[PDB]
Amino acid sequence: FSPVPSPEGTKETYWETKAPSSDVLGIGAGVSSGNFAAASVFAALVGGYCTGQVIPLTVEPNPLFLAGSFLLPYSWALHVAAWIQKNNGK
Amino acid sequence: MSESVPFLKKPEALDSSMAGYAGFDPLGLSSIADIKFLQESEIKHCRIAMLAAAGSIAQDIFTFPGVSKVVGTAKMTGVHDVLVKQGAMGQILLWTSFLEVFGTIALLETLDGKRAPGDFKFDPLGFSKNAETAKRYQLSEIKNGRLAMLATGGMVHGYFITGKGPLELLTN
Amino acid sequence: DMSASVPFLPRPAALDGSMVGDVGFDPLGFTTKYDIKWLRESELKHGRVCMLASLGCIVQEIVHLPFEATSNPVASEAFFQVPAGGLWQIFAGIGIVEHFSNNFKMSGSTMRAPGNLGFDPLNFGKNPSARARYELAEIKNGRLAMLGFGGMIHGCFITGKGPIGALTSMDWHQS
Numbered sequence: 001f002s003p004v005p006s007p008e009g010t011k012e013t014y015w016e017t018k019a020p021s022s023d024v025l026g027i028g029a030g031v032s033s034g035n036f037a038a039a040s041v042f043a044a045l046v047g048g049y050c051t052g053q054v055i056p057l058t059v060e061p062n063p064l065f066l067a068g069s070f071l072l073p074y075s076w077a078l079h080v081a082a083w084i085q086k087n088n089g090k
Numbered sequence: 091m092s093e094s095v096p097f098l099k100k101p102e103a104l105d106s107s108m109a110g111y112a113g114f115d116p117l118g119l120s121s122i123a124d125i126k127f128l129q130e131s132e133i134k135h136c137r138i139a140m141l142a143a144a145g146s147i148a149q150d151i152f153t154f155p156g157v158s159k160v161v162g163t164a165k166m167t168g169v170h171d172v173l174v175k176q177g178a179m180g181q182i183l184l185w186t187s188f189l190e191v192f193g194t195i196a197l198l199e200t201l202d203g204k205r206a207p208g209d210f211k212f213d214p215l216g217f218s219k220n221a222e223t224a225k226r227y228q229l230s231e232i233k234n235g236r237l238a239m240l241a242t243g244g245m246v247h248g249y250f251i252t253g254k255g256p257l258e259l260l261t262n
Numbered sequence: 263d264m265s266a267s268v269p270f271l272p273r274p275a276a277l278d279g280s281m282v283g284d285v286g287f288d289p290l291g292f293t294t295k296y297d298i299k300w301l302r303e304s305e306l307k308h309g310r311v312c313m314l315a316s317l318g319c320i321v322q323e324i325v326h327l328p329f330e331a332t333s334n335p336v337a338s339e340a341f342f343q344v345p346a347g348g349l350w351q352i353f354a355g356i357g358i359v360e361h362f363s364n365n366f367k368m369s370g371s372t373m374r375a376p377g378n379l380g381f382d383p384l385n386f387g388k389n390p391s392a393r394a395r396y397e398l399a400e401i402k403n404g405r406l407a408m409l410g411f412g413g414m415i416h417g418c419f420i421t422g423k424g425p426i427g428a429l430t431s432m433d434w435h436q437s
């Protein structure tokens with residue numbers, strides 16, 4: 001009804017192709033599909049290892065293993081970005 | 091290809107004009123983040139580390155009058171704990187934070203592209219008016235800072251293992 | 263172009279070099295957000311209070327009335343010792359003076375010249391060439407006073423001995 005504002009740098013992201021344009025990756029638009037795939041596996045293994053090392057949680061958990069455990073969900077987003085980049089030819 | 095690493099491709103974001111360019115970015119971190127931000131951060135890390143490495147050696151060589159009572163034996167990281175209890179560390183933090191607030195404004199100007207990164211126009215004694223000497227001095231600053239970053243980590247880890255401190259460990 | 267005080271940062275647009283006591287020092291750009299005349303009026307008002315206050319703190323330690331509770335050598339401690347009725351009298355007087363000075367005008371209403379209340383019982387500045395140097399003097403001495411009064415008031419909180427006693431008797435040879 002009036003112009004709806006968006007932050008500067010807003011671009012069009014609507015896609016009907018096989019994979020979205022690399023712009024949907026934000027700052028990761030230039031990273032290669034191999035680099036996301038290797039980061040995906042690396043984050044999955046390190047995150048799973050760190051998660052496993054603190055499954056019986058104590059009052060003294062290792063903070064590096066807590067922080068490293070956040071790599072498991074981050075790896076999901078990494079392999080999605082790897083599929084997007086492989087299907088954009090990157 | 092890259093001058094540093096022959097097998098890998100040349101990093102796209104990095105250019106020869108920028109000081110301390112070896113074409114070294116195998117993981118391509120320069121693509122992910124704005125290069126101007128990375129340049130400003132690298133220079134800042136270099137200067138803090140340079141002060142840190144010189145200070146680490148200096149504290150072994152000599153200590154300021156009256157400091158010895160407050161710091162009984164602790165060196166490197168250990169001194170910080172005692173001076174944190176006393177007022178030294180807090181007063182340094184306060185004045186550095188005040189400097190950084192203006193540094194935040196400077197960082198914004200560098201990110202916009204208006205101002206060259208890492209330059210605060212601080213040349214109290216003229217050393218870079220030649221415009222040929224300036225570039226050599228800039229390369230010297232980058233290389234010395236990189237060495238000091240590596241050195242600061244190297245020294246502190248030796249303190250962690252033995253507690254000797256940089257010069258004492260070399261003697262024994 | 264670029265601020266003289268802060269070399270790296272660009273010059274604030276609002277200043278223009280016109281105002282007295284300007285060296286280009288507005289890194290955080292308060293001037294863009296707020297009216298320059300109101301900002302300067304606040305700066306002068308803050309400084310004038312501080313100049314009087316700093317002289318007062320030193321004088322309160324050095325001199326006392328022949329009365330109890332006005333004999334305290336610590337500025338803050340004396341504020342507690344002195345009767346509330348007197349503090350109320352001053353506060354009411356200051357409020358009446360603000361009403362008197364502005365002819366009942368608020369920030370929008372007040373904006374006249376910046377800080378030029380025009381109270382001149384003795385006109386030191388008869389010459390226009392000599393004046394603007396009295397302007398410059400006032401702003402620089404007031405800024406110094408604001409920092410000094412704060413420095414003194416906190417020293418009174420910490421040492422508790424008053425300004426001159428604290429300065430001469432620095433803690434010496436103890437942790």
Ligand code: CLA
Nearest residue numbers: 138141142144145148149152153154157161169170178212
């Ligand atoms: C990252 C840097 C860093 C850090 C965190 C510390 C931290 C500390 N030092 Mg070390 N120190 C440093 C650098 C550093 N120092 C440097 C560069 C030197 C000279 C080579 C020293 C020499 C030194 C001695 C001799 C002693 C300490 C001591 C201490 C402790 C008490 C604070 C004090 O009195 O320092 C005082 C330190 C200084 C006055 C030196 C600062 C000099 C640098 C070059 C500042 C330069 C500012 C620059 C000119 C302005 C640039 C402006 C620009 C950014 C725009 C504290 C843990 C004391 C201690 O407990 O020792 C066991 C002590 O006795 N320092």
Ligand code: CLA
Nearest residue numbers: 311314315317318321322326327331332333334340341344
């Ligand atoms: C911001 C300024 C300021 C503030 C908030 C105070 C506040 C205070 N003063 Mg201080 N004082 C000041 C400035 C200030 N003074 C100045 C500038 C002087 C002269 C150098 C003095 C001299 C002074 C003395 C001698 C004493 C106090 C005392 C006191 C306290 C008790 C009130 C009292 O008995 O007043 C009494 C005040 C007087 C007897 C005379 C005050 C005359 C004024 C403040 C000086 C002239 C100001 C200026 C010309 C005003 C222009 C007005 C114009 C805008 C119309 C009170 C907390 C008393 C105290 O407890 O001492 C520890 C006390 O004995 N004051």
Ligand SMILES: CC1=C(C#C/C(C)=C/C=C/C(C)=C/C=C/C=C(C)/C=C/C=C(\C)C#CC2=C(C)C[C@@H](O)CC2(C)C)C(C)(C)C[C@H](O)C1
Nearest residue numbers: 140141143144213214234237238241244245248255256259
């Ligand atoms: C003049 C002035 C200026 C200025 C300035 C300043 C303050 C300039 C200072 C620059 C400095 C402080 C440079 C210091 C670099 C230190 C290095 C490279 C460390 C090497 C150590 C190594 C390799 C090691 C090691 C060790 C290991 C790890 C473990 C130990 O057990 C053993 C051992 C010790 C061997 C500027 C530019 C601001 C402007 C203007 O012009 C005015």
Ligand SMILES: CC1=C(C#C/C(C)=C/C=C/C(C)=C/C=C/C=C(C)/C=C/C=C(\C)C#CC2=C(C)C[C@@H](O)CC2(C)C)C(C)(C)C[C@H](O)C1
Nearest residue numbers: 287288289290291292308311315318337338340341408412
């Ligand atoms: C300009 C600039 C910026 C800045 C900045 C800075 C440094 C700003 C500093 C501002 C300061 C320090 C202001 C101080 C105000 C103090 C006052 C009004 C006290 C008055 C005294 C009173 C009320 C009293 C009294 C008393 C008396 C005398 C005696 C006692 O018995 C009783 C009592 C205790 C009641 C930044 C960097 C942010 C960026 C920006 O882009 C440009």
Ligand SMILES: CC1=C(C#C/C(C)=C/C=C/C(C)=C/C=C/C=C(C)/C=C/C=C(\C)C#CC2=C(C)C[C@@H](O)CC2(C)C)C(C)(C)C[C@H](O)C1
Nearest residue numbers: 313314316317382383384406407410413414417425428429
């Ligand atoms: C204008 C004009 C006239 C007028 C007038 C007037 C009222 C003029 C009065 C001007 C005054 C009172 C100026 C005083 C400023 C105070 C300063 C600069 C001190 C700063 C403190 C420092 C540096 C400090 C400190 C300290 C620290 C922090 C800690 C301490 O332990 C120790 C230590 C002491 C070292 C009138 C109205 C009559 C009419 C005329 O027609 C026009």
Ligand SMILES: CC1=C(C#C/C(C)=C/C=C/C(C)=C/C=C/C=C(C)/C=C/C=C(C)/C=C/C2=C(C)CCCC2(C)C)C(C)(C)C[C@H](O)C1
Nearest residue numbers: 139142166167168169170171239240241242243244246247
């Ligand atoms: C904790 C704590 C504190 C502290 C503290 C401090 C000062 C902590 C600082 C820690 C630092 C600076 C660690 C840096 C490590 C550098 C590394 C691992 C790089 C190695 C190089 C590599 C892997 C490869 C290099 C390479 C080679 C060999 C070949 C390839 C090329 C190249 C890249 C050159 C305090 C002060 C609060 C006290 C408190 O009581 C405790």
